[PDB]
Amino acid sequence: GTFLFTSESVGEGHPDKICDQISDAVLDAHLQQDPDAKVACETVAKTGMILLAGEITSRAAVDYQKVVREAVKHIGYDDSSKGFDYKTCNVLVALEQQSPDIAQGVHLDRNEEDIGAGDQGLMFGYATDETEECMPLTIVLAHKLNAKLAELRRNGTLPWLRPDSKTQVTVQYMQDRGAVLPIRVHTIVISVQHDEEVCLDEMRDALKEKVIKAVVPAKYLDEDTIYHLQPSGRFVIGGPQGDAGLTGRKIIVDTYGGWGAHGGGAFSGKDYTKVDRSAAYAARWVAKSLVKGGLCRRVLVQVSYAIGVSHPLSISIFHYGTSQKSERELLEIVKKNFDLRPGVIVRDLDLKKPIYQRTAAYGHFGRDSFPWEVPKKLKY
Amino acid sequence: EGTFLFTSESVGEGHPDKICDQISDAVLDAHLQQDPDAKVACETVAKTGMILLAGEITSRAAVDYQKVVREAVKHIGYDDSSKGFDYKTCNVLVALEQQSPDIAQGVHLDRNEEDIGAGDQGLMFGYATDETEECMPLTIVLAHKLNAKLAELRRNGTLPWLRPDSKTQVTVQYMQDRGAVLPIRVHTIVISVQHDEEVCLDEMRDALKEKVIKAVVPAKYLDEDTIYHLQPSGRFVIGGPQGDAGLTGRKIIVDTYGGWGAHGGGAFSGKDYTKVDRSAAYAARWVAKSLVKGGLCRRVLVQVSYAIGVSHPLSISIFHYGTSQKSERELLEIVKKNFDLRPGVIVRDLDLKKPIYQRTAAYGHFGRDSFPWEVPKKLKY
Amino acid sequence: GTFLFTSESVGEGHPDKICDQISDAVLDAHLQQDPDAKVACETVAKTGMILLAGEITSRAAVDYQKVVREAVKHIGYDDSSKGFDYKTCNVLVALEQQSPDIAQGVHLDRNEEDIGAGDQGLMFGYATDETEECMPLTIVLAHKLNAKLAELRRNGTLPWLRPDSKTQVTVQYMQDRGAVLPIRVHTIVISVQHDEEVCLDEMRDALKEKVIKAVVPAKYLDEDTIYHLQPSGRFVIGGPQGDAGLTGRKIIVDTYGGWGAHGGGAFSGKDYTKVDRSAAYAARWVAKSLVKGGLCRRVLVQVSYAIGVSHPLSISIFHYGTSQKSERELLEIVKKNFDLRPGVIVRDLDLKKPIYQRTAAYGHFGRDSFPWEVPKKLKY
Amino acid sequence: EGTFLFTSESVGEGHPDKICDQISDAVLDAHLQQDPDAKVACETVAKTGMILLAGEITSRAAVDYQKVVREAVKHIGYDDSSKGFDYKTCNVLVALEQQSPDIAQGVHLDRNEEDIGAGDQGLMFGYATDETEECMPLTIVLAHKLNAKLAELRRNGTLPWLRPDSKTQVTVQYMQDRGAVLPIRVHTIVISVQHDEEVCLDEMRDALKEKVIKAVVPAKYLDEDTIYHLQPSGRFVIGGPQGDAGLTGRKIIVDTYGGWGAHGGGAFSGKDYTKVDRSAAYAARWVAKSLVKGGLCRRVLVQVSYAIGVSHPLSISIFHYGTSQKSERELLEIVKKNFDLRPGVIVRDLDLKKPIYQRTAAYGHFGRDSFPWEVPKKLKY
Numbered sequence A, C: 001g002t003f004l005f006t007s008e009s010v011g012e013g014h015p016d017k018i019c020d021q022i023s024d025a026v027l028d029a030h031l032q033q034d035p036d037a038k039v040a041c042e043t044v045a046k047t048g049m050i051l052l053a054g055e056i057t058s059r060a061a062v063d064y065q066k067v068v069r070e071a072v073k074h075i076g077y078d079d080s081s082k083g084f085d086y087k088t089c090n091v092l093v094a095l096e097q098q099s100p101d102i103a104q105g106v107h108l109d110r111n112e113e114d115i116g117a118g119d120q121g122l123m124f125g126y127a128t129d130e131t132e133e134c135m136p137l138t139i140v141l142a143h144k145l146n147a148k149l150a151e152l153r154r155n156g157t158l159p160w161l162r163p164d165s166k167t168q169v170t171v172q173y174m175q176d177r178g179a180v181l182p183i184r185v186h187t188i189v190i191s192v193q194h195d196e197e198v199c200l201d202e203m204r205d206a207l208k209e210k211v212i213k214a215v216v217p218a219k220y221l222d223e224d225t226i227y228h229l230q231p232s233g234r235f236v237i238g239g240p241q242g243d244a245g246l247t248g249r250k251i252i253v254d255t256y257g258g259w260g261a262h263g264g265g266a267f268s269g270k271d272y273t274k275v276d277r278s279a280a281y282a283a284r285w286v287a288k289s290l291v292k293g294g295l296c297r298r299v300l301v302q303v304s305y306a307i308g309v310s311h312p313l314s315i316s317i318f319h320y321g322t323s324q325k326s327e328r329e330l331l332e333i334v335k336k337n338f339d340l341r342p343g344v345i346v347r348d349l350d351l352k353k354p355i356y357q358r359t360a361a362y363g364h365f366g367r368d369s370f371p372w373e374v375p376k377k378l379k380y
Numbered sequence B, D: 001e002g003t004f005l006f007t008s009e010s011v012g013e014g015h016p017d018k019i020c021d022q023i024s025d026a027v028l029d030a031h032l033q034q035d036p037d038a039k040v041a042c043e044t045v046a047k048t049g050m051i052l053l054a055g056e057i058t059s060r061a062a063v064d065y066q067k068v069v070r071e072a073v074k075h076i077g078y079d080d081s082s083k084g085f086d087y088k089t090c091n092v093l094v095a096l097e098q099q100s101p102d103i104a105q106g107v108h109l110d111r112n113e114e115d116i117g118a119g120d121q122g123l124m125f126g127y128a129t130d131e132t133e134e135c136m137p138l139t140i141v142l143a144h145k146l147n148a149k150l151a152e153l154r155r156n157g158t159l160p161w162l163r164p165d166s167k168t169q170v171t172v173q174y175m176q177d178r179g180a181v182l183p184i185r186v187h188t189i190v191i192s193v194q195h196d197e198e199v200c201l202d203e204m205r206d207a208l209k210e211k212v213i214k215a216v217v218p219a220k221y222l223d224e225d226t227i228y229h230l231q232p233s234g235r236f237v238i239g240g241p242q243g244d245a246g247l248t249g250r251k252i253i254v255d256t257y258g259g260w261g262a263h264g265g266g267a268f269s270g271k272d273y274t275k276v277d278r279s280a281a282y283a284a285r286w287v288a289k290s291l292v293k294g295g296l297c298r299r300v301l302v303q304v305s306y307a308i309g310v311s312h313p314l315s316i317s318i319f320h321y322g323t324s325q326k327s328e329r330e331l332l333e334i335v336k337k338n339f340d341l342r343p344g345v346i347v348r349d350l351d352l353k354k355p356i357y358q359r360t361a362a363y364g365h366f367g368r369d370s371f372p373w374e375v376p377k378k379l380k381y
Ligand SMILES: C=[S@@](CC[C@@H](N)C(=O)O)C[C@H]1O[C@@H](n2ccc(=O)[nH]c2=O)[C@H](O)[C@@H]1O
Pocket: A014, A015, A016, A164, A165, A166, A191, A232, A233, A234, A235, A237, A238, A239, A242, A243, A244, B039, B040, B041, B056, B057, B099, B100, B102, B103, B106, B119, B120, B121, B308
C-alpha cells in the first residue's frame, strides 16, 4: 500500500530563478518608494544579458541598472570564469506604463477594501502534516539541499561551488486514511555548477556527506537510497549561459512541487493587486491554518472568486478524508475566521511591504518569516 | 452537498504568451523540416514591436529566423499598426547560440537512440477523465473551443471585427461521483476578445452570446442563471504584445488540464524530444487516456520523474481517485508491462521528430485527434 | 578656370538623421530639468527598433519611451504602411551613468569659466560669402530641398511623400582670388520615399516644378542642368527598414558638406561640456563674424586647444587670400573680440538651453535662429 | 610668420568605436570568404557586455555570427571581466535582415559588373602630401604608429600591463612652403591607454616616453619643449565598451587623413564594394597618391560624387594647393585619361572582393603597404 512521489527545486543561480529574483527585486524597489505601485516586470536572462520587459506605473524613481546588478551580485555571479558577471553584463530595459486598457477596469478610483476582481477564481492552496513546515517532504528537502549548497559556497567550505544548481527528491509514501506518511527517501538527484579544478570524486563525496547527510534526517536514509550525484558528469558551464532564463518558469518549484494543484499564474514581478499572487498566498494561509488547527491532516483549498463580487463566490475544501468534520463543516469555520476579499488580504498579510525578493527563491511556501506561513488561531 | 465549482481558462493565438509558444514551435518545426535530430531549446519574448528569440540550438539546418518568425505572426493575423502589431515592420532580435557542450556530453552524444538520457531532470504528469468523449475536463475543453470558434469566425469573415488576442474562462458546477466528477451546469463564462474601434459593444456581446457561446456549449449545460461576462473589463482595442510582455512557457496549465490533475513545471514549446519536459508529458497523457478509454478507470493521474543523463524514469506513480476495481499498485503493474517511458523509445512510439509541433502550440496540447498521444494503445494484461 | 563641387543632405526621415534627432531630443529633455546635465546618448534605428545606448548623469527624470516616440511622431512615421510607427515600435534603453573614470578628470568640482580641457584642439570653422547664409551654395540648396519636401508632405500638397529623403547638389564654380563664385547648378539628385500609388512620372514632375524650381533661384538653372530625380526607380521601402541608422553618421551633412575641414566628432547626443560640439559652434561663430564683418570673403578657422589651458593655445586663420589684412592681423582682431575659453563659450552662446533637437536636421550651420549664426559686431 | 599648429588623433583596436569598425569588417570578410558577390551593410554597436549586429546582408554564405564576433573580440584582447569585457561571456544580439529589394533593383540586379550603379549617393575625397614617404600627413602617421606600437608591446609581453583601449593625439608645428606644408617639430603628444590596477603611474609614463614615443617619432621632431600628457585624465582602469557606447563609422577622420584634406561623410567598415562610400574613396586615395608619387604635385585633393544607380561619377575635382606647374584643370584631364572611377571597374583594379578588409579597420585605411590603393599607378600623359 505504498507509492512514490518526486519534487524538484533550484538554487539562486538557476537562470529561470535568477529572473524571479530580479523581477521581484524590481518590485521591492518600487514598493519601497511607492506602496501603491503597480508592477508587472518580466526578466529574460541569456549569456551576458538581462532584459527587463513589462509594464510599470509608479511614482518611484528606480535605478534599474543598479537593482539588476545588485541582485546578480547577491546570487554570486561576479566573474567571467563563472559564466556571468554583475559588473560587466548587458542590462536592457523595455519597461513601459501599465497598459491603459488594463488600468481603467481594475484600479483607478476604487475603494481598496471593496474591490471585487477583474478576473476569475481558480487559485489553490495546500497543506500537509508530514512536515512541521506543513509542506510535502519531497520539496522541503529539495529546497533545503539547494540552500545548504549556497550556504557552503558563500562561507568558503566548498569554494569550488557555483550558483547554478538543481535538486530532485523522491520519497516513498504510505497512505493513511487520505493522509500520507513518509517512510524513507527513495532517490536523490543533485546537479551543481562547479569549478574547473575539483574532480568528480571529491564533489560526489562532499554532496553526500556535507550536504545530503546534513539536510536529510538520517531516519529517512538507508543503504537502499539511490544517489544521482552530478549525473551529467561535467557542469562548469551554467547560469544564463547554459539555458535561457525567464520569469515564472519554476511555478511548481515556487508552490508545492507537484502536490495539490495550480491555476497557472506566476508570482514574481507582480504587485499585490494581481490576484494570481495575493489569493494564492491566502489559500496557503487558510490551508496551513486548518492543518495546524487540528481540523485535518491534509487539505486542499480552492477559492472561486468572481468579477463583480468582492467576497469569494465559492470555497470548496478537499480534506482528502483526514477530518472528522465534513468538507462543509470546515466551510463555516473558514468564513467565520477568514475574510478573503482581495483588498482585505493585502491588509491582513501586509502585502504592501517589500518582502517579495525573499520569496523568489527556495519556495514561496513553507518558510518561517512570512505572513502567510503563521497560522491564524481559529475560533469556532 | 457533494457539489463544487471548478474553473479553467484558455487564451487565443493572439495572446502574448501564446504568440511566444507558437513562434518557438514554428522555429522547432523549421529545424525539424531539415534536421530531424535537431536540439532545439528556443524561447521567445514578445513585447511592443519586438519578438526576441533566445536559447540554444544545434542542428545541421539553415533557417531564416526573420522569415519564420514573421510568417508565424502573419498567420496569427497581426498585419497592421491598427491592431497593435505588424509582422512586416516588427523588430526581430536573435540571441540564439549553440547548446551547452556540458549538457550535450551527458544527454545524447555517442549513445544510440534507445539510451538517450533525459535532456534535463524534472517531473511530469498525465491525466484523463471520462466526463468528455476526448477524456478531458469539460472546463478546459469548453474554454479551448471558445477561443477556437472566435478564430474560426474571425478568419472566414463572419465577424470581421475580431482581432487575434482573446481569453476565456469557464466555471462549471460539478458533482462528486464515486471518485469521478460529473459536470452538471456551466456556472459562469467570461470572454475578452480584441476588437476594432468602429463596432459597438451591443453588437459584440450579442454575437458573443449567440454565434460562439451557443455554438460551442451544449444547451443542457446552459440555463437562465449562468453569468455572462462578455467584454467585462470594458474596451479591448489594445491587445497583442503591446499590452503584456509575453514569454514562452507562461501558459503551461492552459496547455494541459486547466488546473485538473497536476503539473511538474516543464513547458512544451520550443523543445525537441530529448527534453523530457515535453515528451514524457505527452507519454503520460497517452498512458492516462488509454487507461480510461480501456475501461480500467474513470479518472486517473500518472506521474513520472527523470534525472539529467539517466535513460529510465526515476519513478512512476498511479492514482485513480478510487474510480477502479483494481488497486493503484495493480494499475502501476499494468502500465509498466505495456509502456516504455525512456526518452529514446517514446520518440519511435509517437513520431516525435516530425515537424507537427506548431499545431499543438494553441487550444491545448491534449484532447484533440491527429495527435499520436491521443489515439489510445490497446493494453495487454 | 572653373571647377565642380558637390554636397549632400538628408531629410528628417533618414534613419541616420532620425537618430540625431532622437539623441538630441533626449538631451533637450535632460537640459530642461537639469541645465548641468551630462549627456552622451547614442541612438540605433533598425526595423521597428529604437535603441538608446550611452551614459547620462543627471538630476532629471525623463520618460524615454515618451521622448523617443514623440520624436518619431514629429518626423512623420506613424503607420505600418510607411515602414515605421511611433505607436508600435520597440524602444530599448541601455543608458547608464557617465563613466566614473570620465567624470573625475573633466567635471566634478571645477569652476566653470576656468575649465581648460580634458582633450585636445582640432576643431574647424568655415564661412563663405557665396550665400547670404554665409555657407556653401551646394549644401544650402541641398538642405533646402529636403525641407521643401517635408513642408509639402505635412500640408498635404504632395500626400504621397514619405519622410525618408536624400539630396545632392553639384555647383559649377569659378575661382576669384581665393573666393569662389557660383555661376550655375550643374547636377541635382533627389531620392524620396513615396507612396505605393503615385507613378514615376508624376513624382519627377512634382520634384522639378514644386520642389526644385521653388527652392533654387532660376538664375542658377539653365537648359543644361542635369536632373537625377528618383534615379533608383522605386522607393516605397525607407526609414530604419531600408538602412540601419546611427547617431553621428552624417557629420558632413551636419557641417559644411565637404568644404572646410572636420575633426571627427559628432554633435548629436552630447551636452555643452563636450568640446567637440561647443567649440565647433564657436569656430563657425568666429568664421561668420569675419566674413560678415567685411574682413574676408572666405575663411577657415582652426582653434588648437590644450589640456591644462583654458584659453586657446593656438588660433590659425586661413583666409584663402580673400583679405587685405594678413592671416595674423586677423588674429589680433579675433582675440580682441572673442573669448574662446570652453566655459565662456557656453555663457556667450547660451548652450545650456534645450535647443539641440532643432540643430539635428537640415544642418547645424547656416540657419537663422541660432546663437552661433548671428555675427558679432567686431571692434578693432 | 607662415607657421601654424595642426593636430590629428588615432585610437587603438580596443577603443569602442574601432571595436565596431573591426567587428563589422570581420563579418564582411566571413561573407566574402564564401560569397565574393556578397552585399554587406553590417553595422556594429558596442556597450557594456553587448555587441549588436544590425544592417542588411544578402549573400549565399552561412557564417556563425556568435563565433565571428567573439573571435574578433578575442583578437583585440578582451578575454576577462577584469578588463571590462570578455568574448567568452558577452551578449551578442543579431538584428541583421536582407538588403532592401528597392535598393537591389536599382544598384546591381541584372546588370553586368562594369555597369553596377553606385550603391548610394554621396561624395568622397582623396588626399596625398609629400611630407612623408607614405604620402600622408605626419600628424596622423605618428598617431597611428603610436597605437600600433602600444599593441605590439602589449601582445609580445614587453608591457604586459597594457590593455586594448588606447587613444593618441599628435600636434605638429608646420610651415607653409609654396603651397605644401613642412613639418618642423612635434609640439604636443597625448597618450591615454588602458592598464591594470597593480602598475604605478610612474612606471607607465616612464615606459610611455622611452619605449613607444621615442621608438616611433624621429628624434629631430622631439626637443625639450614638446609637451607630454601621458595618462592625463588620471587613472584608466575602466575601458572598452564599458565606458563609451561604440558605433560603426564614428572614427571616419581617424580612418582617413586625421583632419587634413576633406571628407564626404561616408564610413568604410561593414560595406562591400558596391557602396561607393568605401570603394570610391579608396580609388581617390589611389589617384591622389599616384599624382604625388608621380612628381605632378606635392599636395593634392581630389573629389568624386555619385548618384544612387548611376555608374559614372557625377563630378570630379582636382585641387593642388598651388604645388604644381600644371593647372588644376590639366590635372583633371590627366586623371580622367588614366583612371576609371565606375564602381564596377574599380573592383577589378583593386581586388576589392578579397576578404582583406578587417586589416584596414584600424591604424588608418591609408598610408600602409599591402593595400592595392597604396601602390601607385604609372600614369600616361
Ligand atoms: C538542461 S537545462 C535547459 C536545456 C537547454 N538549455 C538545452 O538546450 O539543453 C536546465 C537546467 O539543467 C542544469 N544543468 C545541469 C547539468 C548540466 O551539465 N548542465 C545544466 O545546464 C542547469 O541548472 C539548467 O538550468
